[PDB]
Amino acid sequence: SGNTGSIINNYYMQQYQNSMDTQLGNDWFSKLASSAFSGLFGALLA
Amino acid sequence: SGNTGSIINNYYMQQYQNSMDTQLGNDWFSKLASSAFSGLFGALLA
Amino acid sequence: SGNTGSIINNYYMQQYQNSMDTQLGNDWFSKLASSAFSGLFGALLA
Amino acid sequence: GIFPVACSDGYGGLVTTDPKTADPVYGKVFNPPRNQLPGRFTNLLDVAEACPTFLRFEGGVPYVTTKTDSDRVLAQFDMSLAAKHMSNTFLAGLAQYYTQYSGTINLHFMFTGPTDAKARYMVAYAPPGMEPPKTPEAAAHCIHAEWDTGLNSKFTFSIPYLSAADYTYTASDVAETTNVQGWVCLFQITHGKADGDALVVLASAGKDFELRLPVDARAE
Amino acid sequence: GIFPVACSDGYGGLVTTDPKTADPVYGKVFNPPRNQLPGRFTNLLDVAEACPTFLRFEGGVPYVTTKTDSDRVLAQFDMSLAAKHMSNTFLAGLAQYYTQYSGTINLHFMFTGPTDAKARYMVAYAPPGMEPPKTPEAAAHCIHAEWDTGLNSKFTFSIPYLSAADYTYTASDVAETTNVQGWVCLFQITHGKADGDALVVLASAGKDFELRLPVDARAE
Amino acid sequence: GIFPVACSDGYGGLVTTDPKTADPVYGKVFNPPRNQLPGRFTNLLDVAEACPTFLRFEGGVPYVTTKTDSDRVLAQFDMSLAAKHMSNTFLAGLAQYYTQYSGTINLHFMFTGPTDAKARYMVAYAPPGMEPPKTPEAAAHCIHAEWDTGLNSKFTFSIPYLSAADYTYTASDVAETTNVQGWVCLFQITHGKADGDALVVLASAGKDFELRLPVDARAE
Amino acid sequence: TTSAGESADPVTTTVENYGGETQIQRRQHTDVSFIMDRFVKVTPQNQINILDLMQVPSHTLVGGLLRASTYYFSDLEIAVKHEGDLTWVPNGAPEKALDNTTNPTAYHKAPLTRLALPYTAPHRVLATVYNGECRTLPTSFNYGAIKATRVTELLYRMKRAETYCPRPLLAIHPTEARHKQKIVAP
Incomplete structure (x- = not known):
């Protein structure tokens, strides 16, 4: 997903190639950038 | 498509092996050569 | 077909591995050897 | 027998x-x-x-x-993303790690004077090929916007990407004496008692701004 | 265990x-x-x-x-594609990068004289094995075409590929004193007041002309 | 990670x-x-x-x-395919490139005398283990065929493959003083006025003749 | 056939005009992709080499044929013999970048390094000839640059090539009636 480009599958299990993530219970700057105001604010003329 | 002749598929994705083309919005000499007049122009006799 | 014995398929296309034959439009000694007379020619007795 | 393989040079x-x-x-x-x-x-x-x-x-x-x-x-x-005026922005800090860009860069202008200080301003984009305008009047022929102060303190303007090629260089070559992508020109049309008041300006990436071709070049 | 492999010599x-x-x-x-x-x-x-x-x-x-x-x-x-007469055509510039060809080469002849200049011409292909004809009359026995001037200024003729083998060489060997593929012979049958007028001639590839076996041989 | 492989010795x-x-x-x-x-x-x-x-x-x-x-x-x-008598036949020219054979070898006999010359002939195969017969009469106990001249000039006979092992050697070892595969014996029973006439003989491979195990051994 | 020669519409007559028969042609060896797609040697600079296809000599097959087009596009492969490690930097990089190893650097592995590189120019196509000064070609016309302690051999191979607008392709001009050569013979 970063800079990787092999089409075939890894020879090693995922549990050996990477650490495994656990859960408890572009996220913020993406939401922030999408919420930007892109309008006008006056009355427009022509 | 040029000078390439492996039957099996590339190990790397296409996005790594080549640049990717984008679109906006033998083409001319092929059309030109196909349109060549190959007739006669007189009246033919025998 | 001569002296070749790999079971798996060639990595290169056939068009790169060999020249390609074209057509226009054991053949003779096999036919010749098969047509050989193997009989007798007399009358046989016993 | 075992599987034969060509260990390839190069x-x-x-x-x-x-x-x-x-x-x-x-x-x-x-x-x-x-x-x-x-x-x-x-x-x-x-x-x-x-x-x-x-x-x-x-x-x-x-x-x-x-x-x-x-x-x-x-x-x-x-x-130019290598302009001195841009040299402390995050956009310039990012741009040094890529060789090409295109798309919009937005400039933000915020008036900081008191309630009884008023002004009217003009920003113009002057494209390469002629010397940049020195007066509001010569600059009126460029793509430009003019605005004044009031209840809203900020005005934002998109500098357009305009070039012969589809991408431009983020660095500036030592051969290039005139800036290859033009100038931005900020003028004051007039003011009423705004002497000494500051207009602060910021820059951010526009919606289609794009950086491509990562490069590491010493630099910090 | 792991997969065994023979790293092959050669x-x-x-x-x-x-x-x-x-x-x-x-x-x-x-x-x-x-x-x-x-x-x-x-x-x-x-x-x-x-x-x-x-x-x-x-x-x-x-x-x-x-x-x-x-x-x-x-x-x-x-x-011969190595003939001096062919040496500035694109066809000869292409042919030097291949070792064999076959198929048709077309010759085009365009009359450039004024409206009151007239002529009649003959082009013949003389195959190898006999000296090329020196007169329209000896040449009449070859494959040939004859034409005259008029409203249309151009005439085009296909030189036929005729050879014992199916392909010929685009280069000419230093051993080959007689041209291996014959001659083209252009004659003037007569003219009426065309003295000094020019017939310009061009060459192009025919429908089945084919170049095969790319080669790089210094040359330019 | 990548695929691990053992580059194998040998x-x-x-x-x-x-x-x-x-x-x-x-x-x-x-x-x-x-x-x-x-x-x-x-x-x-x-x-x-x-x-x-x-x-x-x-x-x-x-x-x-x-x-x-x-x-x-x-x-x-x-x-023996290494016999001097066989040394100009195509069968012997082939057999030198293989180490073993089995199956039938056919001999052809063609009478060349005039219409008033007559003869009767006998061919016998004498297997190894006893000296070859010296007379038609001792040879009658072998596998044999007898024929005479007439309208058809040719007679063909199959020498049988007979051996303890299933294949024999096409070469002859310098140790082998007696021929390991026996003898062929051609006799004349009588003739009527055929003095000096020639019987010409040829050899060809039979239906089940087989050569196996290609070998290159200098030789020509 | 006669025709109007002033016009420039192509006229292709065939041997059928006098009774022959046009045969079939197989033209894969003059396909542009195919024919540009093979390596060609350039003489390298010792250390910095900018990757520029106009370095391949004009008499070679690839140089002759690249100059027969005015605009072209391709990706690139290079094979390089070098001492040390080899760094490539894209089009538009500062020359100093060639010393930073996070830019694609290939560590020495005998006997040479073969690399696949993308087209990287800011233009939709590049050109073999450009009429700006009239010899010099804009500096953005390149595929980046490479550097190593010493580079000994450099070969270029065009991948996926496209050519637009053909330009003159010249053979040797013979001095005698035919250009004669010693051709490989038994």
């Missing part, structure tokens, strides 16, 4: 950028959970669009002050 | 022509769009058929002028 | 006979058409069966002439 050396991964040696490790941490960012240009940072004007200050003299140029600089 | 060296590709090192680059650019060509022989280029006659001129004397040979040369 | 050297192919370097070549050329042969033994070639008798001649004296042996030789 392949196999370590490349510092290659698309493959190393063989693992220490398996089975499970991490502390970190789902939902605040503040993640995935793409450096989301923060370049959402967070404008300050321009730098003569004196090392992020603002320009209204002048009271016949000269109406408040600032004029190269539309 | 395989694996770089070949300047091989059918395989290098490993990539810099991914994800998207190009400027270039769909629909004018003037593309895919096969060098489409342009060799569609664009005839000029032959070269003694003096370095692309034409032959009508003679007014008993000699009716306007030009006679080796049907 | 595999990978070039073998002059191996069952694999080289990597290609010059693609896309199309040949002149050659379908239907006359005279193809696919298996060297089709021509060894269909084309008998001559035996060689003392004097370097392909025939034996009728004798008029009490000795009735026309020829006696080792049933």
Whole structure:
């Protein structure tokens, strides 16, 4: 997903190639950038 | 498509092996050569 | 077909591995050897 | 028999950028959970669009002050991510690690004078090929916008990408004496008692701003 | 255990022509769009058929002028892509990078004299094995065509591929004193007041002309 | 990670006979058409069966002439593909490139005397283990055939493969003083006025003749 | 056939005009992709080499044929013999970048390094000839640059090539009636 480009599958299990993530219970700057105001604010003329 | 002749598929994705083309919005000499007049122009006799 | 014995398929296309034959439009000694007379020619007795 | 293979010359050396991964040696490790941490960012240009940072004007200050003299140029600089005026923005800090860009760069102008100070300003984009305009009047022929002060203190303007080629260089070549991508020209049309008040200006990436072709070139 | 393999001797060296590709090192680059650019060509022989280029006659001129004397040979040369007469055509510039060809080569003849100048011409292909004809009359026994001037200024003739083998060499061996593929013979049957007028001639590839077996041999 | 492999010792050297192919370097070549050329042969033994070639008798001649004296042996030789008598036949030229054979070898006898010359002949196969017969009468106990001259000039006889083992050697070892595969014995029973006439003899491969185990041993 | 020669519409007559028969042609060896797709040697600079296809000599097959087009596009492969490690930097990089190893650097592995590189220019196509000064070609016309302690051999191979607008392709001009050469013979 970063800079990787092999089409075939890894020879090693995922549990050996990477650490495994656990859960408890572009996220913020993406939401922030999408919420930007892109309008006008006056009355427009022509 | 040029000078390439492996039957099996590339190990790397296409996005790594080549640049990717984008679109906006033998083409001319092929059309030109196909349109060549190959007739006669007189009246033919025998 | 001569002296070749790999079971798996060639990595290169056939068009790169060999020249390609074209057509226009054991053949003779096999036919010749098969047509050989193997009989007798007399009358046989016993 | 066993499978025959051609170990090919010219392949196999370590490349510092290659698309493959190393063989693992220490398996089975499970991490502390970190789902939902605040503040993640995935793409450096989301923060370049959402967070404008300050321009730098003569004196090392992020603002320009209204002048009271016949000269109406408040600032004029190269539309270049290597411009001195852009050199402390995050956008310039990002741009040094890529060789090409295109798309919009937005400039933000915020008036800081008191309630009884008023002014009217003009920003113009002057494209390469002619000397940049020195007066509001010559500059009126450029793409430009004019605005005045009031209840809203900020005005934002998109500098357009205009070039013969589809991408431009983020660095400036030592051969290039005239700036290749033109100038931005900020003028003061007039003011009513705004002497000494500061207009502060920031820059951020526009919606279609794009950086491509990562490069590492010493630089910091 | 792991998969056993025989690293085979005799395989694996770089070949300047091989059918395989290098490993990539810099991914994800998207190009400027270039769909629909004018003037593309895919096969060098489409342009060799569609664009005839000029032959070269003694003096370095692309034409032959009508003679007014008993000699009716306007030009006679080796049907060879290495002929001097062919040496400035695109077809000869292409042919030097291949070792064999076959198929038709077309010659074009265009009359350039004024409206009151008239002529009648003959082109003949003389195959190898006998000396080329020196007169229209001896040449009448060859494959040949005759034409005259009028409203249409151009006449085009296909030189036929005729050989014992199915392909011929585009180069000429230093051993080969007589041209191996025959001669083309251009004659003037007569003219009415065309003295000094030029017939210009060009050559192009015919419908089944074919070049095979790419070769690089210094040459330019 | 990448796929692990054991480059195995003892595999990978070039073998002059191996069952694999080289990597290609010059693609896309199309040949002149050659379908239907006359005279193809696919298996060297089709021509060894269909084309008998001559035996060689003392004097370097392909025939034996009728004798008029009490000795009735026309020829006696080792049933060996390395026999001098067989040394100019195609069958012997083929057999030197293999180490073993089995199956039938056919001998052909053609009478060449005039219409008023007559004879009767006998061919016998004498197996190893006893000295070859010296007379038609001792030889009658062998597998044998007898024939006479008439309208048909030729007679053909199959020498049988008879051996303890299933294959025999095409070469003759310097240790082997007696021929290991026996003798063929050609006799003249009588003749009526055939003095001096020649019986010419040829040999060809029979229906189940077989050569196996290719070998290159200097030799020509 | 006669025709109007002033016009420039192509006229292709065939041997059928006098009773012959046009045969079939197989033209894969003059396909542009195919024919540009093979390596060609350039003489290298010792250390910095900018990757520019106009370095291949004009008499070679690839140089002759590249100059027969006015605009072209391709990706690139290079094979390099070098001492040390080899760094490539894209089009538009500062020359100093050639010393930073996070730019694609290939560590020495005998006997040479073969690399696949993308087209990287800011233009939709590049050109073999450009009429700006009239010899010099804009500096953005390149595929980046490479550097190593010493580079000994450099070969270029065009991948996926496209050519637009053909331009003159010249053979040797013979001095005698035919250019004669010693051709490979038994």
